[PDB]
Structure formats: C-alpha cells, structure tokens
C-alpha cells in the first residue's frame, strides 16, 4: 500500500 | 486515531514515522526532539510477546510526513538510524512501565515549513499542564477503528483523566510513569489513540510562551475508543532525567 | 532547542490552527 520510496535509502 | 480529524499542513512538524524497510510498512510514530534526536515508545522497537525487536538497520525514519502512503517528494525526508536507546528499565514483561525510547539520526535533519523539533517539559510546565481535564493532542497515521487506515496525519484533542478514574478503568497495574487520557461516556465526544499510533506524541500548547511540549508518548490501552477505557501515555517529563542522560552522554 | 515547539506555519506567522482554542479553553 506504500508508495516506493528512492533506492538511496535503502542502500 | 479513532474518531479524529485530518491535520492541517504543517500542524505537526515534529511528527515523525518509524517505518520497516521490509516489509515496507508503519511500525510506529515518533516525535523530532532535535536535529539528531527522535523520541518514541520502547515497544515499537522491543516487545518479546509479539517476537519484535528491531535493530537499526531494519528501520527508516520519516520526517515531514501528511500522506500516510505517498512518498511526499520535495517534503519528507528520510534518516538512517545510527543508535538506538531504550530505556534500562523499561518493564515489556507487564505493563508497559517506562515505555520510552530514543533514536539517534546518522546526519541532522534540515529543518523546513514541515519539521520541526518539539519541545520537552520542564518540571513549571509539567505541573502547570497535567492536571485532569486540561486537553492534550494526539497525532499518527494509526487505525481509524479498533477492528481502515487514514490517507493524512490524523488528530485528536483529548482531556487528560484524574489518576484514580484511569485505574478504576483498568486491571493493569498503573504506574507514575503513565497518565492516561480520553473522555469519559458521560462526556458525548469520543476519540483515541489506536494501534500504529504507538510512539507519537501528546502534546500540549503552554499557555504561558505559546510553545508546543510533549507530555506524552502514546503506549498502551484495551482496544480503541471503548466506551470507560481511556488511552495511556507515557509521562514524558518523569523519565526526562533519563532522556537527558543518554543525550549528554552520546550526542 | 531554543526555537523548540513554535510552528513554522503556524506560531511563527501568527496564524493559529482549527482546533487549539479547544486546548486553551481547558486550561485553567
Ligand atoms: C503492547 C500494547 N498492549 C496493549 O495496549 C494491550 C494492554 C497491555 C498493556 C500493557 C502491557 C501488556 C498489555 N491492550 S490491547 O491488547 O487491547 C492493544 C490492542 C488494541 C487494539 C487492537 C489490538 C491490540 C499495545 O498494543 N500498545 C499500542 C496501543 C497504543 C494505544 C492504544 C489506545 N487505545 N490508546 C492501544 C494500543
Ligand atoms: C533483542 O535483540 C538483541 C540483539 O540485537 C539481543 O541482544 C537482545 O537480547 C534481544 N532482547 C530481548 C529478546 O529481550
Ligand atoms: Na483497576
Ligand atoms: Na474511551
């Protein structure tokens, strides 16, 4: 239900 | 929140959403109490009955926020966890006693229209302001109903309780480290705190510097908005020494 | 912080919110 948020804070 | 309103912009820039990287999900809310430092309750990141217990690298922090869902490109803005903190005594075994935690930020957090650092009370203000029937309010992106789930920041005014009503409503053993708040049946208006709004904030505006404080941190309650159940708080100011302490020694 | 609790959008300006009146009148 989330929206996708930037790779650079997943990383 | 079970029977609020949509925040307006801007109305709590403190505001702050713990958020789990995977599954990507709410886990909780939380307050800005610093450009490095957030605030929120201990059983968002360790409650052993529910198998939880996060470390840093499994959360997000997100400031900024309106949309629960959206990724408010331009708006929010998103922080690694470098530490976290909880509380040595906080009590997960029974009820909830010390239910607070903190979180250190890997970098600060620009300030901006939408965040923000609340502020914490000093002992004046906490006796001023936490007395039975002065209001507080309570904002998260938590279940609209105990048994779906807001587009935007919700809010609810809620007067906090006489101590003796609140454990007169309960068989939980109450602490001085929990207040509770919400309005009796007696009283018509209704609301709540519910599950996801856990770790944010109640606060309060003094009427004294015209400043926002937080007094509670949401904890615990039996179900959401029931009729002689009221929502407890962790009491922010008792456990300031502590808060205080952590900040001193590692920020 | 010393700025701490006073809202951009709101103190700040002057502008007050829907519903903190609500917060005043209770206190006593
Ligand atoms: C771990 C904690 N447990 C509880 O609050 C227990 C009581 C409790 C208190 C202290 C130690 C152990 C148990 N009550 S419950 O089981 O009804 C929670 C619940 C509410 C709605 C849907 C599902 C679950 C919890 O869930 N805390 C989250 C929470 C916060 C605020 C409210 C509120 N109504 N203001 C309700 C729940
Ligand atoms: C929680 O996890 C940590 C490790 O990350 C562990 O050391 C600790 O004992 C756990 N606490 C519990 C299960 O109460
Ligand atoms: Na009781
Ligand atoms: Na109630």
């Not at chain 2, 869902?69 to 909830?96: A, G, Q």
């Not at chain 2, 309570?138 to 609810?156: A, D, I, M, R, Y």
């Not at chain 2, 159940?229 to 300031?240: Q, S």
């Given at each position: 239900?989330?929206?996708?948020?930037?790779?650079?804070?997943?990383? | 929140?079970?029977?609020?309103?949509?925040?307006?912009?801007?109305?709590?820039?403190?505001?702050?959403?713990?958020?789990?990287?995977?599954?990507?999900?709410?886990?909780?809310?939380?307050?800005?109490?610093?450009?490095?430092?957030?605030?929120?309750?201990?059983?968002?990141?360790?409650?052993?009955?529910?198998?939880?217990?996060?470390?840093?690298?499994?959360?997000?922090?997100?400031?900024?926020?309106?949309?629960?869902?959206?990724?408010?490109?331009?708006?929010?803005?998103?922080?690694?966890?470098?530490?976290?903190?909880?509380?040595?005594?906080?009590?997960?075994?029974?009820?909830?006693?010390?239910?607070?935690?903190?979180?250190?930020?890997?970098?600060?957090?620009?300030?901006?229209?939408?965040?923000?650092?609340?502020c914490?009370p000093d002992?004046e203000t906490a006796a001023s302001l936490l007395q039975?029937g002065y209001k507080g309010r309570?904002?998260?992106?938590?279940?609209?109903?105990?048994?779906?789930?807001?587009?935007?920041?919700?809010?609810?005014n809620?007067p906090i309780?006489?101590?003796?009503?609140?454990?007169?409503?309960?068989?939980?053993?109450?602490?001085?480290?929990?207040?509770?708040?919400?309005?009796?049946?007696?009283?018509?208006?209704?609301?709540?705190?519910?599950?996801?709004?856990?770790?944010?904030?109640?606060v309060m505006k003094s009427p004294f510097n015209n400043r926002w404080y937080?007094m509670?941190?949401?904890?615990?309650?039996?179900?959401?908005?029931?009729?002689?159940?009221?929502?407890?708080?962790?009491?922010?100011?008792?456990?300031?020494?502590?808060?205080?302490?952590?900040?001193?020694?590692?920020? | 912080?010393?700025?701490?609790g006073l809202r951009?959008?709101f103190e700040?300006?002057s502008?007050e919110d829907?519903t903190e009146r609500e917060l005043l009148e209770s206190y006593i």
């Open positions: 239900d989330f929206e996708e948020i930037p790779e650079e804070y997943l990383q | 929140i079970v029977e609020g309103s949509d925040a307006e912009i801007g109305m709590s820039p403190w505001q702050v959403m713990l958020f789990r990287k995977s599954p990507q999900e709410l886990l909780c809310g939380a307050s800005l109490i610093s450009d490095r430092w957030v605030l929120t309750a201990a059983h968002c990141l360790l409650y052993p009955p529910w198998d939880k217990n996060f470390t840093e690298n499994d959360l997000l922090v997100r400031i900024g926020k309106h949309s629960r869902t959206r990724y408010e490109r331009n708006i929010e803005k998103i922080s690694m966890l470098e530490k976290i903190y909880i509380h040595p005594r906080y009590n997960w075994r029974e009820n909830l006693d010390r239910d607070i935690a903190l979180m250190k930020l890997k970098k600060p957090v620009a300030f901006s229209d939408y965040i923000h650092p609340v914490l002992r039975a309570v904002t998260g992106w938590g279940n609209l109903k105990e048994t779906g789930q807001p587009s935007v920041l919700q809010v609810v809620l309780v006489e101590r003796p009503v609140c454990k007169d409503s309960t068989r939980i053993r109450i602490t001085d480290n929990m207040f509770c708040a919400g309005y009796k049946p007696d009283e018509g208006k209704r609301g709540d705190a519910c599950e996801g709004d856990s770790g944010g904030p109640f937080q509670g941190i949401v904890s615990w309650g039996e179900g959401c908005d029931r009729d002689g159940k009221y929502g407890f708080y962790t009491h922010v100011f008792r456990l300031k020494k502590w808060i205080q302490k952590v900040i001193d020694q590692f920020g | 912080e010393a700025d701490c951009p959008l700040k300006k502008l829907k």
